[PDB]
Amino acid sequence: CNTCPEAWIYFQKKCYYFGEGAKKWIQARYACENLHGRLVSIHSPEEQDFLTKRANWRGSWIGLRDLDIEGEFIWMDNQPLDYSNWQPGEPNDAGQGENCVMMLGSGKWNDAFCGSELHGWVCDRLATC
Ligand SMILES: CC(=O)N[C@H]1[C@H](O[C@H]2[C@@H](O)[C@H](O)[C@@H](CO)O[C@@H]2O)O[C@H](CO)[C@@H](O)[C@@H]1O
Ligand SMILES: [Ca+2]
Ligand SMILES: [Ca+2]
């Protein structure tokens, strides 16, 4: 039906917001909430393909994190871990600990320090049709 709030993009019964501007993961979380969505949750290769094609080449935050329990990733939509697109070797919990997930410019996922500033962040919301 291709029906979304203004500035959002429709794909398979969800609307997506391709946010831009440097944000830490928590700032991106609340930026999405301010727009009445959440950082994006990804549950199929077709959805990943939609995002990969449109992703910010400098990287972008998504709605996946292991902040609560290390190695237990949780989606913003709280749905199961039924699809992954990890960059090879990721998540690697590098450095002091990497608990927030980004898409690299390629769309592949990397865990990163939650306080890194990325210039992209993607929100989603349920579409009305
Ligand atoms: C290559 C890459 O993923 N670069 C991003 C960087 O990633 C960290 C770390 O998380 C990766 O596991 C290793 C893989 O070699 O590389 C870097 O050390 O995280 C940054 C955010 O903190 C991103 O801006 C980079 O794109
Ligand atoms: Ca971690
Ligand atoms: Ca990593």
Q: Quick check: CB of 120 below 6 Å from ligand 1?
A: no
Amino acid occupying residue 19: G
Cα(32)–Cα(74) distance, integer angstroms: 17
39 close to 62: Cβ distance less than 8 angstroms = yes
Instruction: Find out whether 72 is annotated in a ligand binding site.
Output: no
Cα(73)–Cα(58) distance, integer angstroms: 23
CA of 6 to the centre of ligand 1 (A): 33
- What technique was this entry resolved by? X-ray
CA of 3 to the centre of ligand 1 (A): 35
| Sequence-separated (6 or more) residues with CB below 8 Å from residue 114 | 24, 25, 26, 65, 67, 98, 99, 100
- Ligand 1 pocket test, pick from 65, 110, 114, 121 with the greatest ligand atom count within 8 Å of Cβ, gives 110
Closest approach atom of ligand 1 to CA 58: 26
Return the DSSP state at 38.
E
Helices (H) and strands (E) in the chain, counts: 2, 8
Give the number of other CB atoms < 10 A from CB of residue 87.
Answer: 16
- The maximal CA–CA distance of the chain, rounded, in angstroms, is 45
Place of tokens 């890194």: 116
| Domain edges within the chain | 7-127
Is the CATH number 3.10.100.10 carried by domain 7-127? yes
Place of tokens 């999405």: 32
CA of 110 to the centre of ligand 1 (A): 7
